[PDB]
């Protein structure tokens, strides 16, 4: 009926972050690992840990049974989604409820309604949330794609219903281009997800991403606990967060919260989440998401607002009435940076390798979500980030100087990292607004940023033991003599 032992099944940073949350809360904690992770910081931090096996994530972490077997063998009465993998698949919410385990997440309905962002748009139209109007329903076929592009005007955005992470989506400038993007989108979507559901809408030339956190209660309390801005982006991904959301007036923040209240009530929502927006450089709000994972961006809200958000998630999963019931006032400003394994000296091409050195910044005004440690090994077989850097201050100016120093401190060797990109972009002026507007927009890094970086230059053994004839697979290192 209540949380008592928590298993979190995800790789790296979020596993550490929420195992840390359990360790803080005093919850019993269970990890799981693939073969490259058998000595990872998470497996060595958790109170218990269990092998899923497998060399790379796709061999193992997708298998519901391999999770729930470890859940029932550890006695993890609670399971946490984190972000990625199964964190937002209703198959697993079903499996956890039928197994009788605490899903630390929104209900099967509350995920089903929001895993496809199309359903969030279909709610949003009814909620009167500021759209990128297009059509709320997808158009039927490329014959309509050309007609709607001619009717509404190019550029048009062509998007798979599930294309999240910035890679299932396309944009076209001219009315002759759009049918090839609509075919390309459909066939790549079929290749990645099997499903083919795809929608088309008018593009925005200078939007800016913003989202607001929402917490909601089994006893019906709701709180809009903070705001974040995600404007700095490269290869179309979130990489820097700014919080509370800067360069937005109360006339934006009003609908950013009040449409979130309406849309979460229209979703019947309970549990935690976020509502996400694209705001024009002219300040004009339009939609992107209502979001149900614990966003990886959590540190800057965790520091600007008085909440250990996953501890609050524990209380919400406990069904306790919210002891946070006020829309808060967020302090000052904070920055956060995703510490990617890419070589900024080499066009940000991915860069695997051994983490022969790792030093991440400490002290006042700076925090780390370290998900890797010295002597570890990194590669694209798992999630792309080593860690995250987090910065805060009384205002942007202080958090900016703190960011420049923090990124000059943050040192990693043995593989390339995006840390020198962060140092550069924290120096590049467009990010430093005038006080009423600021100059950074989408594509700004990959169109205006000043690059400066120089290129860097036994197996386990399984033995079977039987106890009264009950099988028990045991594993040891290949030598112990």
């Amino acid at each position: 009926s209540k949380i008592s032992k928590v298993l979190v099944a995800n790789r790296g940073e979020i596993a550490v972050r929420v195992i840390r949350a359990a360790k803080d809360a005093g919850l019993a904690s269970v990890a799981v690992y693939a073969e490259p992770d058998a000595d990872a910081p998470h497996v060595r931090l958790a109170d218990e840990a269990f092998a899923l096996g497998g060399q790379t994530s796709a061999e193992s972490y997708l298998v519901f049974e391999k999770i729930l077997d470890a859940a029932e063998k550890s006695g993890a009465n609670a399971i946490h989604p984190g972000y990625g993998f199964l964190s937002e698949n209703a198959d697993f919410a079903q499996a956890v409820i039928d197994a009788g385990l605490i899903w630390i997440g929104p209900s099967p309905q509350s995920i089903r309604d929001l895993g496809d962002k199309v359903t969030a748009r279909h709610i949003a139209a009814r909620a009167k949330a500021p759209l990128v109007p297009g059509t709320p329903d997808p158009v039927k076929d490329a014959d309509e794609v050309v007609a709607f592009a001619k009717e509404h005007g190019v550029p048009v955005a062509i998007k798979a219903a599930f294309g999240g992470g910035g890679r299932g989506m396309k944009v076209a400038r001219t009315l002759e281009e759009i049918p090839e993007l609509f075919e390309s989108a459909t066939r790549e979507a079929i290749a990645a997800f099997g499903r083919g559901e795809c929608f088309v809408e008018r593009y925005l030339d200078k939007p800016r991403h913003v989202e607001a956190q929402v917490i909601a209660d089994q006893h019906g309390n709701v709180v809009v606990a903070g705001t974040r801005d995600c404007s700095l982006q490269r290869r179309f991904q979130k990489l820097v967060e700014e919080a509370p959301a800067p360069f937005l007036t109360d006339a934006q923040r009003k609908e950013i919260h009040e449409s979130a209240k309406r849309i979460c009530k229209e979703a019947g929502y309970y549990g935690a989440g976020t509502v996400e927006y694209l705001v024009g450089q002219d300040g004009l709000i339009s939609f992107l998401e209502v979001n149900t994972r614990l966003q990886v961006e959590h540190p800057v809200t965790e520091e600007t607002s008085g909440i250990d958000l996953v501890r609050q998630q524990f209380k919400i999963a406990n069904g306790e009435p919210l002891d946070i019931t006020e829309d808060p006032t967020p302090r000052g400003h904070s920055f956060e940076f995703r510490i990617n394994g890419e070589d900024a000296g080499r066009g940000f091409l991915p860069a695997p390798g051994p983490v022969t050195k790792f030093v991440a910044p400490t002290g006042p005004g700076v925090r780390m979500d370290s998900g890797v440690e010295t002597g570890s090994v990194i590669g694209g077989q798992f999630d792309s980030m080593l860690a995250k850097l987090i910065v805060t201050g009384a205002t942007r100016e202080e958090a900016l100087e703190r960011s420049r120093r923090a990124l000059a401190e943050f040192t990693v060797e043995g593989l390339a990292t995006v840390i020198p990109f962060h140092r550069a972009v924290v120096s590049d002026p467009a990010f430093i607004g005038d006080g009423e507007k600021f100059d950074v927009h989408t594509r700004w890094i990959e169109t205006e940023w000043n690059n400066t970086v120089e290129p860097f230059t036994v197996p386990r053994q399984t033995v079977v033991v039987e106890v009264g004839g009950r099988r028990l697979e045991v594993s040891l290192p290949g030598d112990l003599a």
Binding site: V463, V464, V465, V467, G468, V474, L476, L480, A481
Partner: protein, 70 residues
């Protein structure tokens, strides 16, 4: 499956006591007995030291057998 396993025929240990048992037994377990690089070297083999009558059948059933057996 047809391997011969270790059986705990009596008792019901906890997984920690299983781990202790296994780490002890696994580090007690013998090393590379019957080594993989036992070369053949017939230099001065005792069968060549023996006197054999010119007609001794052991020239077939001992000497030649011992040289040719591989």
């Amino acid at each position: 499956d047809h391997e011969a396993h270790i059986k705990v025929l009596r008792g019901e240990p906890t997984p920690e006591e299983m781990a202790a048992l296994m780490a002890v037994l696994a580090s007690a377990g013998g090393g590379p007995a019957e080594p993989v690089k036992k070369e053949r070297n017939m230099w001065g083999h005792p069968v060549d030291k023996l006197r054999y009558s010119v007609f001794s059948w052991q020239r077939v059933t001992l000497l030649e057998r011992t040289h040719m057996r591989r």
